[PDB]
Symmetry: C3
Subunit: 221 residues, 3 copies
């Protein structure tokens, strides 16, 4: 009919244009607010993915654990054996469980860096299931290696750790693919990726820096 | 004077800001609609480029053809002899003309991948003009080669196809530059690029997948 | 109360959405204008950075100079000895001071391309301070080298220029870091970067092209 007269309405239209164009900053405020909306959405979306797969993260038997089982705070460490930052990052992660009895870590091998991360992983898993107590040695050694993994040096590490006896089961591939499906469900794109409390860290971190985070979650009880 | 009072107008201005900022989604709807506008424009712009150069695509003599001439549906294949996907992609393209008599293909060599795509092409063109019937052999062989092209292996393929006799004419460079100007006119950035009906495909495709498209254009009569 | 009735206001809100969405171009005009705002801001921000550090650009003693000192127009040349475009670019820069007595150039070595740009630079600086007249030879030679710099070939150039006698002072590292802090203050990201009048050029340029710019600043008196 209508609620504004023709003239008024037309002027409104003109006012839109003029407002945004003569004052750009309003567009920036709108951008920022759309950004802030999308961020917040994702963050909540992660927080749900994370909260849903509690039982594959924390309660998988096939997944290797470092430190006590009862340990109040259990971290989760997505590592690739071929990833150079993981090799640098892992020792710390280990150090905390020795320093902090209440802390433990869980290992999730990922095959993205190469064929050998896959075979390596598979080995470590086979070991884990066939003999848990043994695992740490082989894990450690494989991480200690700087050079890229081949099928022999896997034998060589396995041998140098007295685990060469163990056959790579096929059951251990499921675990790999599961760590793989899992890393997708959490929208994890890279490695090392560490789960702590309700927070995830996709890179490597200084020790002192790490200690404050783990203490901060210790305080969360 | 004017069509809204000062107050009203000011409130309108304020309402712009508040609307977009308190409701980000409107900005997203506007984005999407500007995107949709630009897309549609380009698509129409391609469809014109494509429709204008009908006569260089379909009616060039210097361009090599595979299959019957009268063939109802003529595809056009922009290929680089050094491009690995083209080597994989070409055999199919050929298979259809043997399966489907109504189909033919036209070859457009492009020199972007290396000096040798240029010289190779030039050869194939020289051959095409000096002796059309011969072409297919040399084309085939050059595609069959996995290793990167040098000036000798060009001789070697030419020899293995009994075309070594033919001199690279300078007239054949025009054809190259023309295929080159043409690929620009159609905003073709990469290779393999295949023209079919009024549609263009810039990569490689499964056979079964391809058959449905060619049949779909066969139905377009 | 208020300045528009409920209905009117609601319609305004609806009008925002409809205006931007049914007419995308307004959003484009707003983009462009926000872009134009940010550009203009930066340009003014550079022009201030440039104008503030007049005294480190033009009046540093530790910085090497090519051409007369009194020279009316002094260019400034950020070059890396390992940068291939700088090697190509420098001779011209030199040619102008020989062609145009009124022109001079100042050299600012930058260490971003490699360790050897740093050591090279440091040498050239040490030389500059210990003996200014000598500098040009070593600068020239180091630029004349196509192959990447090592610690020996630095000796070799120094030797071939009869400057091997000079010790790399530690005082010359300050100059490097200063050229480094300076290049940051001007938001210089790459090399060769040349300051001329109130304008900066981050790449290499044809001679004839360069002559017009230097003449254009000569006219700016």
């Amino acid at each position: 009919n209508a609620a504004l007269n023709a003239a008024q309405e037309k002027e409104v239209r003109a006012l839109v244009r003029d407002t945004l164009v003569s004052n750009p900053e309003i567009l920036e405020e709108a951008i920022m607010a759309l950004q802030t909306k999308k961020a917040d959405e994702q963050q909540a979306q992660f927080r749900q993915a994370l909260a849903s797969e509690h039982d594959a993260l924390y309660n998988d038997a096939a997944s290797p654990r470092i430190g006590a089982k009862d340990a109040k705070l259990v971290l989760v460490s997505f590592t690739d054996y071929n990833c150079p930052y993981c090799k640098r990052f892992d020792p710390l992660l280990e150090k905390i469980t020795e320093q902090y009895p209440d802390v433990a870590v869980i290992i999730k091998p990922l095959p993205f860096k190469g064929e050998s991360s896959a075979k390596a992983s598979q080995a470590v898993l086979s070991v884990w299931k066939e003999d848990p107590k043994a695992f740490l040695a082989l894990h450690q050694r494989l991480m200690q290696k700087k050079t890229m993994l081949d099928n022999a040096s896997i034998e060589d590490a396995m041998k140098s750790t007295n685990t060469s006896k163990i056959k790579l089961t096929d059951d251990s591939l499921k675990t790999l693919q599961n760590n793989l499906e899992l890393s997708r469900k959490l929208g994890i794109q890279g490695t090392p990726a560490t789960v702590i409390g309700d927070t995830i860290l996709p890179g490597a971190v200084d020790y002192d820096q790490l200690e404050i985070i783990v203490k901060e979650q210790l305080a969360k009880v």
